[PDB]
Amino acid sequence: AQDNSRYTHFLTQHYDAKPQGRDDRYCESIMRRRGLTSPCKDINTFIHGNKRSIKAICENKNGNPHRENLRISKSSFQVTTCKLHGGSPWPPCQYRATAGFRNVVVACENGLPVHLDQSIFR
């Protein structure tokens, strides 16, 4: 049996299929829902759309090798980046939302994404 717990954690931390708003209040709510507010994560990006396209980044179908053992997608994704504001690392956590549309960088293991590289959204 593979341990793919890091894939399901990747989905919890970085996937939201059908977001609606994607405004500041969206970020503040989802960061709480996904357990990312104790302490407040400084930056966190959610990918939207269908799961199969994200998994496909791990193969030639939708990805290329990138830098040191990462992969970069060939398709663009709707994304929302939530950036903490206020000086406290502890809740309540206020966030500013920035919607975007571009390719994403992940790490893959067992053909599944297990890490999002946040650096491209900083």
Judge whether 3 is annotated as a binding position: no
Q: Classify residue 50 by burial, with Cβ atoms within 10 Å: 0-12, 13-18, 19+.
A: exposed
Residues 6+ positions from 42 with CB-CB distance below 8 Å: 83, 84, 89
Judge whether 40 is annotated as a binding position: no
Residues 6+ positions from 93 with CB-CB distance below 8 Å: 28, 31, 32, 37, 40, 41, 84, 86
Judge whether 82 is annotated as a binding position: yes
Active site residue 48: no
Active site residue 115: yes
Judge whether 117 is annotated as a binding position: no
Could you tell me which residues are annotated as the binding site for tRNA? 22-23, 82, 104
Active site residues: 14, 115
